[PDB]
Assembly symmetry: C3
Homo-oligomer: 456 residues x 3
């Protein structure tokens, strides 16, 4: 027989349990093959890809990644795809692990306001990517149309304390990283494989701060990890920990005791972790500019007792987590809304600036602006700043080097340029600095920075 | 002893059987080591990389990839490399799996009109890439100078019903994707790893349509899969199927039951597939813009009985295969030749347009131009089109959104821009539309589109 | 218990042995767990990244990669990080394989002139990357802040004849490849993952020529191979040889008998090789333009007896090693220093030109300039050259094709353009040619070439 030769469906039909990221449906917990009815709906919708940055996502079930599907090897799946009448595009679905043309795409073409159905037997056990396969296929995937389906072995996977759902994607906006507003899809960047954002679960901060994943010392954690692409291959890594097991798709090979593992575009793996020490453990794409310049960081936060014989040291994790160490950056979202409304206050700028200053400026000038005498000059009550507060704009954009004096002390060092910061970010950061630590006050506007950036 | 320690060559010398892609030489079918004489000739030649697009390829044996070589572990190989007198460049060969300096490159330097020879023992069993290694090495490989050599284990590989030869490459043209004419090699794009085409077996459509690979339900298929690069790593994937086995080079590890697998630049693998359901199964690089925007798709077509218990559904595979669902796009080749000759007719444009309309326009407007009332407006007998047929050029190039009325019906939707289409493609598509479904007729020229594209 | 549960530290504390690339510390050779004290110092310093090209590296222990650390599974490590007072930036360390927040980064933040300490138990056996994790993390890694730590199994690794240390990195300069002078870090190229150099051990030629690694026929060689990134994934390959074993990090899986293997960004592997035939064996990133256009080549040179039954052929390895076949390119370094001083002589140019002519020109015109009658025209005593020595600049920059006559002989062929060469390189090469083989003499300057390059 073929694989998954376990007998005809038995019992009543089961209406499948779909879940939203980062959660997973429960184990099916049964010893017989069933007829499973799956109902999934496409919705096109604006969501925030970053604070104050909107994007028109195309979604399976209202989220990126799409709703998680869970069935048993040998089940017969009757798949119903609906396309909501508000959609502008037609859509379909290709499930990896399906035995048949297009993995379903050939049979699931669905116009706005319509519904399609096709039936397949789940012959192949494993974790699998699904995605839209409507021309132009790359545009549909780039807009968020991907998720995971798990096909369990007949005895089920081994029990663990937590199961989570994490999926990487590369995204292509017309504007640069953190440029505010509604950002269109950019076909030219996509063809060139030059993404502006690389994310877990559809947004910067989706899994950081108050949205981190949780477990306790001693517990086991399984993560179902997808790479929707469309184009990038992930050097997938956990900072400060190790994977007990890594298994790709439905493969017979299992790797154990590794920290860094390559996930193909369109690939999926199951990883297992055992919590040993408290703190924040970071999932990244270790093609490092993705993790630290484009959004590709997620957090598993572990609580419980210290083990000083295993790890003993201070805990200053803002040095690398930067502006994602805090619970959120909601002050930036709020300042951006107020600016669009024409109601932006000095305090709106101050609080947005405070959020952005973490990492970006604090690593050298300190969280309190004091710096370090002779090494990093102070921003707190800075005579150099007060002497020409406008020159601060050029210093942020283009850097500063050479001999200077600040609060009666000599410095001869190098502050690198930070031209990648957007006009609103520079304005908000400097407004924060002017209104803290007994500095003179006032404000800097995005338009002020735009003028300075444009000077030859 | 070393590996492959099977004794001295015995019997008469064997003159090796070389084959052209996508075919493989027969199994050697012998139990003793032999002296094998290999004769391979370099030829530089123009071929079509895409319909109406010519390129000067550099080849081993007249094809891209080059002729397939098949020997037994423990054989002594006497390798003769000839460089045809029509060649402009010198050439050589590096075979992966050879034990010695440059894998042969050090001993096989050959000027136009000359011949070289060197001898090696095949110590290492496996599938291996060979390629040119003449400075500048990257240029030689980018021009097509790569292929595969199989070194069999002494007992031979297990029997299968079919063996095929498929090799990925990245290519660098001065012009953009599908821009017509003789296209030079582009060194700047190559250094930046920004290819214009990513292909199987040296051309768009090399393995699609009437050139697809074949098998029947129940049969086993082995594919020898190479990645010549020069630069890209393939997220190699089969749509709608699974690999029974994947084995890299001569490695001891074998992965089983996977659908997606990473092939390094310069790497090679042997994959095995068992046919279960009829239809078209697609080999792709799942870095998806390569597969659907740059040519990286090949087809295995399976015939035999349906199995409705495994897969039951409609078969509209043009939604993702697009303009490669048809047997070929020969109308485009012909229209391009006629244009170069100054003899391009309206009907030449109509038939080229018909070929290009599949996927590109048909996914929303339908194959018959009827659209879908209230959702996608008709192109068939379109009053909006007839009212200003020239405005159609701007609509294709730059998109259309907002409220419009077409054949007495309101629409308020979004047609994305399609600026990547070349001037001849837009002209031919629109000429097809004007001369179908009782539209007014006439024609649009490439020069008309060039003028509109250049407007601010 | 956890892993590495071998008992409390015993004996006196051990002060750890650190080594500079390409060497490794000795095996620890002990049967008990110890307290190991590690002292490592950050130094920021200018070094030559290529001949006549300086770069400001940020280093662990004065080298790129940083000092190699070697401990035993179950050891307690007391880690002291110092930042030299000459540093301008703060720094820290993340060791892969550490169980705890940031792999240490959270506890090791260290300002210029300061020292930090933290303690960890080495629970996980394997080879692991360490690196700086100070915001902006990508800039710190791109500047050279990475190395390897080995955690031995309790019984030690199997004995071999040689152990070596090789680490790949991608680098981002404002200037182009081989443009002379002090080159700043380029943030824009880094974000886009578009490196100007891709190197082993921090420089072009670090492991070629007189700096090659050595072994003899019959000996075993272990290489500890890292990929510091920040961004690239290596298609890591040995030309003309095979790896007996490849093992990633501390993984349970071991691959055997492969030639090409994918190393993730931030990944590390241990490879094993047995020398079988004399000659130069080349370690490369087989994303080929990295190996042959950006510096990603290193050499293992094997001495001993020939084995003509395994490999029999000539040895012209300059056809692919090009300008790295020679012991060094010190003439280029010297010509660049003299030019900066205003003391550049004709002979300085001649010797720099001689070094650069290897591969670049010699593959077609020969090492003696004679060419090949009717196929490649001579540069030796060339009447065509003497007739208009200035036209030689355009020929190098923009190529030459069509019918020409040279020393009473007809040619109708194609010399590709070589625009990637810098102004000093073209000037030096042509000065070499003018002063060899009874050509007229004189000189060409970098300023002459700059003027010609700028002509429309
Ligand atoms: C990596 C270190 C570093 C980072 C990050 C950094 N700075 Fe600086 N900054 C310096 C150094 C060093 C100087 C002194 C330059 C000199 O000696 O010529 C400086 C000088 C300045 C000055 C002028 C002198 C003074 O004390 O008033 C201002 C204002 C300033 N920085 C603001 C900022 C702001 C705002 C940020 C973040 C957006 C930032 N800096 C990020 C190192 C840094
Ligand atoms: C993804 C959907 C989609 C694709 C693909 C697409 N179109 Fe359209 N097209 C539309 C929609 C929707 C409109 C109506 C726009 C509006 O409501 O403002 C439209 C409008 C038009 C119109 C003007 C209205 C009419 O019916 O005459 C023309 C002409 C047209 N398309 C031609 C084409 C051609 C030719 C192609 C391919 C080259 C193409 N379209 C591809 C969705 C699409
Ligand atoms: C791949 C082959 C190749 C390489 C590499 C190459 N050349 Fe040439 N070169 C030629 C050919 C062929 C011609 C003749 C062109 C023709 O027939 O129109 C030529 C012509 C010339 C000429 C003019 C004719 C003569 O003999 O005086 C000069 C000068 C020259 N090359 C110099 C160089 C220099 C200097 C280099 C390296 C920097 C170089 N070439 C690299 C193939 C090459
Ligand atoms: Cu879709
Ligand atoms: Cu897919
Ligand atoms: Cu060649
Ligand atoms: Cu190779
Ligand atoms: Cu650092
Ligand atoms: Cu790391």
């Amino acid at each position: 027989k073929l694989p998954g030769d376990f007998g005809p469906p038995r019992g009543e039909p089961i209406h499948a349990v779909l879940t939203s990221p980062p959660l997973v449906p429960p184990p099916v917990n049964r010893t017989y093959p069933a007829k499973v009815i799956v109902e999934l709906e496409v919705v096109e919708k604006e969501m925030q890809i970053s604070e104050g940055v909107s994007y028109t996502f195309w979604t399976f079930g209202g989220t990126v990644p799409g709703s998680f599907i869970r069935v048993r090897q040998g089940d017969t799946v009757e798949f119903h795809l609906k396309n909501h009448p508000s959609s502008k595009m037609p859509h379909n679905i290709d499930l990896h692990g399906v035995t048949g043309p297009g993995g379903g795409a050939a049979s699931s073409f669905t116009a706005p306001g319509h519904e399609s159905q096709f039936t397949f037997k789940a012959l192949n056990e494993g974790i699998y990517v699904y995605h839209c396969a409507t021309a132009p296929v790359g545009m549909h995937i780039a807009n968020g149309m991907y998720g995971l389906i798990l096909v369990e072995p007949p005895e089920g996977l081994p029990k663990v304390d937590h199961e989570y759902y994490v999926m990487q994607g590369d995204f292509y906006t017309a504007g640069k990283y953190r440029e505010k507003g509604l950002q269109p899809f950019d076909m030219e960047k996509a063809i060139d494989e030059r993404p502006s954002y690389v994310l877990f679960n559809g947004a910067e901060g989706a899994l950081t701060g108050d949205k981190a994943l949780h477990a306790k010392v001693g517990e086991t954690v399984r993560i179902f990890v997808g790479n929707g692409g469309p184009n990038l291959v992930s050097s997938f890594h956990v900072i400060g920990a190790i994977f007990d097991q890594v298994r790709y798709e439905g493969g017979t090979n299992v790797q154990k005791n590794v920290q860094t593992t390559l996930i193909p575009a369109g690939g999926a793996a199951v990883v297992k972790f055992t919590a040993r020490v408290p703190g924040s453990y970071v999932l990244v794409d270790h093609s490092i500019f993705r993790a630290f310049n484009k959004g590709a960081m997620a957090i598993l936060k572990i609580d419980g007792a210290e083990n000083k014989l295993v790890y003993s040291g201070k805990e200053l994790d803002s040095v690398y987590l930067g502006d994602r160490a805090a619970p959120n950056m909601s002050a930036v979202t709020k300042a951006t809304q107020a600016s669009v409304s024409g109601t932006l206050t000095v305090q709106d700028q101050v609080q947005a600036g405070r959020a952005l200053f973490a990492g970006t400026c604090s690593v050298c000038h300190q969280g309190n602006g004091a710096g370090l005498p002779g090494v990093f000059p102070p921003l707190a009550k800075s005579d150099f700043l007060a002497a020409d507060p406008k020159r601060a704009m050029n210093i942020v954009l283009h850097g500063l080097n050479g001999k200077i004096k600040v609060n009666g002390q000599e410095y001869d060092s190098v502050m690198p340029p930070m031209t990648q910061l957007n006009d609103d970010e520079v304005a908000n950061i400097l407004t924060y600095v002017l209104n803290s630590w007994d500095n003179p006050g006032g404000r800097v506007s995005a338009e002020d920075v735009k003028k300075v950036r444009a000077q030859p």
